Design a binder for this molecule. Sequence first.
Ligand code: HEM
Ligand SMILES: Nc1cc2ccccc2c2ccccc12
Ligand SMILES: Nc1cc2ccccc2c2ccccc12
Length: 403
Amino acid sequence: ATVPDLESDSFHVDWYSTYAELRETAPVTPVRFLGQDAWLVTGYDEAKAALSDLRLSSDPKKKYPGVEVEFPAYLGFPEDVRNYFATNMGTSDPPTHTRLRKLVSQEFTVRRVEAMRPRVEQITAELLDEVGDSGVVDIVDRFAHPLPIKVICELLGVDEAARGAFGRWSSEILVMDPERAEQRGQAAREVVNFILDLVERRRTEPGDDLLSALISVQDDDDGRLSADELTSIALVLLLAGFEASVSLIGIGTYLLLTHPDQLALVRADPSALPNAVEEILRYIAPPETTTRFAAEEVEIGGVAIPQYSTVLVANGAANRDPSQFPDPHRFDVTRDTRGHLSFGQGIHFCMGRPLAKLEGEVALRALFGRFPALSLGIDADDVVWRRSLLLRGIDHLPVRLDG
Ligand code: HEM
Ligand SMILES: Nc1cc2ccccc2c2ccccc12
Ligand SMILES: Nc1cc2ccccc2c2ccccc12
């Protein structure tokens, strides 16, 4: 048959329609992406099973005989910077993942996150106070973008002076263009340098932030975090922790604005926002696809995936599986969102889930409440989507504040 290319517009224009078509052809199909053959999983059952089957590694630095592990996400990154991006929990298999996650979960506690709420509401308040009450504004550059950035930067004790710039660095990191590869390798290097310097400043100037906390964590038999592991933990938390949240807010803002029916519900019932945040994740999952490597020949949904293959688990596609989520195309704030694969599934489940939801709820509530007549300042079908299978989102969302 025809091997679909993941670069084609079909996967970037009304893409939830092509997914559903492939999912109906074969839930597990071979594909071409970035110049490598891979397997795309677009079925719910298949995706869940895949995230649970541990023969599929999340480790890109594992060497095997006569083969080269190349996770698409690392398009362009020189080896030394790849290792810096891949020496944490999200890119490690047990037992290392096990000790890495245990040491971090010790400080990255629900307590710490709950003690943040007040500042999160304060930061949220300050931003909206600076927009005014009239005209059109880019809700991304003015709200959805800085809020998450101020939050995680405060969490990791980022020096606000020598802060910023990475915002441009991560923008470039989130798109995998086979030609801008060098620009992608250069951005990645910059990020790694900011972090290396960040921790050293932290190593020298203690504080009671999560990062200084991680620098002093220790355990009986599990041990403590080494330099490389620590610098990598900090990087992933700061990057995957702010960008993914930005998508939550922007997408979430767009969605309600275009589904007045749902906005009214959220607006009347307060207890409806926690669930509204969940349907947002389900409907347009930021982590469009997740990557695994077949360390052994695996069988997914009757299909035998050859050993040493690159498996791309399309979380976003799995969320729209009709046999698991009835009428997957109706954005419904009342729906049962239980079982969606946006925070992951299995052992690599998102550690930051409670901080993510803390932001989603606090942000959206403040926005729609202080601006009861908030409107989308552009044709809905004109909203530009980010061509990223790595992290989907909106980079410019113009809204009118007063009317
Ligand atoms: C809208 C919010 C977010 C979404 C949708 C999200 C999604 C995910 C996904 C899909 C994974 C699993 C990756 C895989 O299976 O390969 C994951 C892992 C992780 N997330 Fe998030 N995440 C979000 C926010 C955060 C935040 C705010 C932080 C931290 C500040 C964070 C930290 C982590 C960490 C440490 C992991 C790796 C855990 C592991 O692999 O054991 N996430 N997240
Ligand atoms: N929070 C996240 C952490 C990750 C850690 C390792 C690899 C991917 C992700 C990831 C991928 C898409 C969305 C969010 C995340
Ligand atoms: N921790 C992450 C590392 C990455 C490294 C290279 C490319 C993308 C990501 C990425 C993309 C989305 C979320 C997290 C990450």
